[PDB]
Design a protein around this ligand. Sequence first.
Ligand SMILES: [Ca+2]
Ligand SMILES: [Ca+2]
Ligand SMILES: [Ca+2]
Length: 619
Amino acid sequence: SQAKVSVNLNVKHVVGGISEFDRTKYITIHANQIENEWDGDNFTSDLRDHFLNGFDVYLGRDTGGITWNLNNMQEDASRPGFANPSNIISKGINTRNNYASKTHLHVYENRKSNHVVAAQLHPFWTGESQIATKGTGWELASPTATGEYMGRYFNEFYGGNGEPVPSWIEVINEPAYEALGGKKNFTNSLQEIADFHVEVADAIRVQNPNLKIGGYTAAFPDFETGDFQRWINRDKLFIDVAGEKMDFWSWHLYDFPVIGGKEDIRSGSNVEATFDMHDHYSMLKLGHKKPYVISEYGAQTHDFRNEGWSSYRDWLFVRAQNSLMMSFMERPEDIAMAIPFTIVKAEWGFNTDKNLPYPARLMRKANEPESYTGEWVYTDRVKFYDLWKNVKGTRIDTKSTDLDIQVDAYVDGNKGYLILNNLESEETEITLDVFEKYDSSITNILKRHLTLSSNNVVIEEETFSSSISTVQLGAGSTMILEYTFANSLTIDETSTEEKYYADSYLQPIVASQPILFAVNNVVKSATYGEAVLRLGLGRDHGKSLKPIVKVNNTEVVVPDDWRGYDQADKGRFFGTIEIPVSYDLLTTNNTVSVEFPDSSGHVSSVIMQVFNFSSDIRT
Ligand SMILES: [Ca+2]
Ligand SMILES: [Ca+2]
Ligand SMILES: [Ca+2]
C-alpha cells in the first residue's frame, strides 16, 4: 500500500468551534482513581501517578459504586420498590467522608472532567429480566424509582466534601444486549428500554436537574442488521422515544477482530456510517445533534476468551482503539467523552471457572499468563498511552490520499504531533507532504511507531534532526511523529469544517433508479475549500458499493477504496463512502443523485462534509 499524507502545519482545522486536542475526552481509561485497583502490589509505588500523570491520561468511568449501593440500599418503607431516601443520604455521607479522607486521590479530580457513571443493568432494570437488589432483596418499583435512586445517589454520593459529581450519567449500561437477543437480533423493540430512559431521566432530573443524562449505552449499535430493522427497532426508536429526554447519546463501539475467525470491524467506514446515520436521523428527527459518550470502545477478543493475557491480544485492542479514536477525533464537537474499555485490573472480572483474568486490563500480574501471581505490571495496552502521552495542541489540516490512513495532527507551540493510523492490514509507505508557510525548521522528529512486532505490541522509535519524507506505517499500526520546530508554529490559516445533512435518509436502493437527496443551506463561507460527500451505504455483501453519484448533476468519482476494510466478515456492509466533492461543485442547496446497478440495501445517510479554507491550502 502507498499513501501520500498532506500536513499543513499553519492551517487550524476547526469543527464545531473545536480545534484543540482534548486529552480529557480522548486519552482516557475506563477507571476512577478512587478504585482500589490503582493500589495494591504494583510494579511502581504510585500507579495512579505512573499511569495517569506519566501518560497524561484522563478519566473516566465506573459503574460499581452506584450498582453496589442500589444492590445494598434499604427499601423505602413508605414506597415499596424505592430506595429509602434517608439511607441514600446516610450512606452518601460515609462515601463522601471516605473520599474526603483519601487526600492523595484529590489531585486526580483534575483528570475526572469527563467522569462517566453508568448504572449496571441490574437491579436498575425494571423489565422482564429485573432482579431484586442483590443485598437487600427488593425490586425497583419502576424506572421512576430507579431514576429517583440514581438522582438521589448522585446528589448524596458526590459533591460537598466528597467526590465531584460525575459529568455524564448513562442511564443504564447495555440494556438491550441480553434482553433483546444479542448483536444479530433486529426484530425486538427498544421501546421499553427507551421508555425506561425517559422515565429514569425524568426521575433523575427531579432529584438533580443539572446532570447530563444519556442513553441508551448500546452494547452494539448495529443499524444495518436485518435490512436496517435493527436501526428502526432500536436506535431510531431511541431517538424517536427518548431523544428529547437525553442530553447525550451513549454507545459502546467495539471492533471484533477475532469473533469466530471473523474480522467484524467498526473502525473505518462502519463506525463512520454509525455516527453518520445516527447524526443524520437525529438532525432529521430532533433537528440537532447530541454529543456522544463512547463509554466503552476498542476491541473484544472472542476467539481468545478461553485464553489469558497476551501481548498480541492486547494488540487487537490497541489497534482497534487507535483506529476508533481517530474517528472520534474527527468529530470533537460530537464527542462528549470516549473511553477505551480498559479496566485497571478488573479483579472483579476474574473468571474463576476458567481461571482466566478479565480480558480488558491495563495491568496484569507479572507471571501471567502462566500464573495469576507476581506484581501488577502493565499490559501492552499501556503502549497506547505511551504512544499518545504527549499529543496536545491545535488541530491542523491533514489529509491522506488513502482513506485507510487516518491522519490527524496537533501543534502545541513548537511541538507537532502527526498521527498516522493504519485502518488496513497492509503496511503502507506514507509519503509525508508537510507544508509550513514560514520556513520554521525541524530540530527534531521523534518517530514513534506503535505496531506489532513478533506478535508483541511495541513502540519502535527513531529520531530525526530534519524533515522526513516517507515513513513505513505498519499493518494496523499507529505512528505519531513528535515534531520539534525551532520556534512556535504560526497557525494563521483555518479550515472550518461544517457538516450538512440531506433532507432524507435511509433510502432503499433500487437498481438503475437514482436516489435524489437535497443537501441544503450549505454555507460556502470561504473562497477555497473542499467537500466530502458521505454516503452511508447499508448493503448485503455482493451488492455494489460503487454507485454512480452526481452532485448538482455533475458526476463525481466514487472511491473504490473507502475508509477502512472491506467488511467482508461483517454481516453485511454498513459503511460511509467518503466521496471527494470539489468546493466549486457545491452550491447552497445541493442535489445528490445516487444510482446503483443493483437493488437492495439502503443509502442510510447522506452528509456533505464541507471544509472552508481561509486560503488555497490545497494548491
Ligand atoms: Ca483531514
Ligand atoms: Ca487503501
Ligand atoms: Ca479501504
